[PDB]
Design a protein around this ligand. Structure first.
Ligand SMILES: [Zn+2]
Ligand SMILES: [Zn+2]
Length: 53
DNA sequence: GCCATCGATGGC
DNA sequence: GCCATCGATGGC
């Protein structure tokens, strides 16, 4: 739905740990208030423009 | 029950 | 219409 399953972003399995969305994750100490995927993982086709890197 | 991440929403 | 959230839910 928000994933083509085919782009670089979709195939990627590892969070960058450095974008705002990563910083937000509990995985990375963040408060978990934004709740979105790594920016490098936002599908290049289907994502909200303003989620992309 | 938790996690990953989506759609929704209120403020701007 | 957009952002910064926040409620919701599929998949585990
Ligand atoms: Zn990231
Ligand atoms: Zn994709």
């Amino acid at each position: 739905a928000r994933m083509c399953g085919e782009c670089e972003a979709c195939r990627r399995t590892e969070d960058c740990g450095h974008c705002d969305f990563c910083r937000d994750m509990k995985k990375f100490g963040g408060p978990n208030k934004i709740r979105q995927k790594c920016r490098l993982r936002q599908c290049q086709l289907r994502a909200r423009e303003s989620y992309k890197y």
